[PDB]
Design a binder for this molecule. Structure first.
Ligand SMILES: *[C@@H]1O[C@H](CO)[C@@H](O[C@@H]2O[C@H](CO)[C@@H](O[C@@H]3O[C@H](CO)[C@@H](O)[C@H](O[C@H]4O[C@H](CO)[C@@H](O)[C@H](O)[C@@H]4O)[C@@H]3O)[C@H](O)[C@H]2NC(C)=O)[C@H](O)[C@H]1NC(C)=O
Ligand SMILES: *[C@@H]1O[C@H](CO)[C@@H](O[C@@H]2O[C@H](CO)[C@@H](O)[C@H](O)[C@H]2NC(C)=O)[C@H](O)[C@H]1NC(C)=O
Ligand SMILES: OC[C@H]1O[C@@H](O[C@H]2[C@H](O)[C@@H](O)[C@H](O)O[C@@H]2CO)[C@H](O)[C@@H](O)[C@@H]1O
Length: 436
């Protein structure tokens, strides 16, 4: 894709902190950029649509390569069009703004380069306000093994780059992306039957994904997802796997992950409105990526979680599922959880924590987003899923929401002013970001 010129691009600023020891942090002057897929795609000459609703113009885009040459990703009016604002260390993402739904943003090191985090033997903390996230919404903060430059050095017809939010990948091998690897996705494009703005093409973009935070005011999950190749790679067709291929298990990434949602793990009192972590008020989420020998070059062995609210430091609750022990993600936990829930162990099939850790060693990009779910209504996060199962069977119940909740047309109509706000990002050695 070309770099658009109809609307100017300026990346909202966002501060965050690097910590060297508890209480000892310094400020980084970051910025964020909107993902390419939210942008208007305009022909470079006439400033007319290359993509309208969910179909492509056949003159500008007769094939994938020609489309990338003829079409540009426009700049973004972050607040006015996308409902994205920032102030200090805070980033607020609104749900519905005009015809726009949600957003996905990346943290930048500079105007052409995503910030790369090396998570092994480190800790990441942030504050979040999920009080205005009802059933069906997901404010997600997570890491993916994107290229720092958004693909530009590999793909000459990507002239837009990280400056325009190119290069996304995740463990779903997303095929909804209009541009992957310097080519459009017009060949094989199939408009979504239930989303006027989206479709699915033949190409998908795979990479490992560390879902630090997928949450609303009802439930949260922390979930690593390994891929056979840790970093970004293109897939084609059904063999992409992931949620929007015919068979989610046909590809090279684990679409399910090894998840810890305290409600799903048998403690419904822990997280939610008025609960031990009270989602009606902001709180701090700390995540630690421990290695087997406690050094930077060890193998990822354990992912731990702490919350801080009202200055009280609260560990993740223990699993209360028979057969599944502890409050952290480890190989043993993950093997046991899949067995107890009767879920296929795709996590182990794609290399588990060893392959997640390899992706972490490659470096990962921070993503902050807000979305609703045109495949499964977020029921996997906050309801009983699948909806035909007995909610008392271990693994089925994930939150309090009814099984008819989360339909996009309902939540976009009923909760347009919902939002998520992320703030006070801190990163550093284990125990450096909070009072351990
Ligand atoms: C859902 O998960 C939450 C979070 O883990 C869990 O709440 C925790 O419950 C335990 C047990 O009630 C609490 O631990 C006790 O806390 C009191 C007050 O601080 C202490 O006095 C207790 O100390 C005694 O017992 C300890 C062993 O448990 C001994 O080591 C100690 O020497 C004392 O004899 C004990 O630590 C804990 O504080 C809460 N945590 C929070 C944040 O509320 C809850 O039970 C889970 N709910 C369900 C339904 O499963
Ligand atoms: C990070 O801080 C934690 C909490 O103070 C340390 O873990 C405690 O370590 C002691 C000594 O082994 C144990 O007796 C406690 O049971 C631990 N508590 C918890 C909550 O795990 C931990 O060692 C620190 N990590 C590093 C690398 O310094
Ligand atoms: O595709 C929706 C959602 O699935 C999540 O995995 C589910 C899985 O679909 C379900 O079969 C299993 O029982 O539970 C897991 C965990 O909720 C996956 O984690 C999400 O990334 C994905 O968006």
């Amino acid at each position: 894709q070309q770099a658009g010129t109809a609307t100017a691009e300026n990346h909202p600023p966002l501060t965050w902190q690097e910590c060297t020891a508890p209480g000892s942090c310094t400020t980084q002057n970051g910025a964020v950029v909107l993902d390419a897929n939210w942008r208007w795609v305009h022909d470079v000459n006439g400033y007319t649509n290359c993509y309208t609703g969910n179909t492509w113009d056949p003159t500008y885009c007769p094939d994938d390569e020609t489309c990338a040459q003829n079409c540009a990703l426009d700049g973004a009016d972050y607040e006015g069009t996308y409902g994205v604002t920032s102030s200090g260390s805070s980033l607020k993402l609104n749900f519905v703004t005009g015809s726009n739904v949600g957003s996905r943003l990346y943290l930048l090191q500079d105007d052409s380069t995503y910030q790369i985090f090396k998570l092994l033997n480190r800790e990441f903390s942030f504050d979040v306000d999920v009080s205005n996230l009802p059933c069906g919404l997901n404010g997600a903060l997570y890491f993916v093994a994107m290229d720092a430059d958004g693909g530009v050095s590999k793909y000459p017809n990507n002239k837009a780059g990280a400056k325009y939010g190119t290069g996304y990948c995740d463990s779903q091998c997303p095929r909804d992306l209009k541009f992957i690897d310097g080519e459009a996705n017009v060949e094989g494009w199939q408009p979504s039957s239930n989303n006027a703005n989206t479709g699915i093409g033949d190409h998908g973009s795979c990479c490992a994904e560390m879902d630090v935070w997928e949450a609303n005011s009802i439930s949260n999950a922390v979930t690593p997802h390994p891929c056979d190749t840790p970093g970004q790679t293109m897939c084609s067709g059904d063999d992409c796997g992931g949620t929007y291929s015919n068979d989610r298990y046909a590809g090279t990434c684990d679409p399910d992950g090894c998840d810890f949602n305290p409600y799903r793990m048998g403690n419904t009192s822990f997280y939610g409105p008025g609960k031990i972590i009270d989602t009606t008020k902001p709180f701090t989420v700390v995540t630690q990526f421990l290695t087997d020998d406690g050094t930077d070059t060890g193998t990822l062995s354990e992912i731990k979680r702490f919350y801080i609210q009202n200055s009280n430091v609260i560990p993740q609750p223990n699993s209360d599922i028979s057969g599944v022990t502890g409050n952290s993600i480890t190989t043993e936990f993950c093997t046991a959880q899949k067995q107890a829930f009767g879920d296929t162990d795709d996590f182990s099939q794609h290399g588990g924590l060893a392959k997640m850790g390899a992706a972490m060693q490659q470096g990962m990009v921070l993503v902050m987003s807000l979305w609703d779910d045109y495949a499964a209504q977020m029921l996997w996060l906050d309801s009983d899923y699948p909806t035909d199962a007995d909610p008392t069977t271990p693994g089925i119940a994930r939150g309090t929401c009814p099984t008819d909740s989360g339909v996009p047309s309902d939540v976009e109509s009923q909760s347009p002013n919902s939002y998520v706000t992320y703030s006070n990002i801190k990163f550093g050695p284990i125990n450096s970001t909070f009072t351990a």
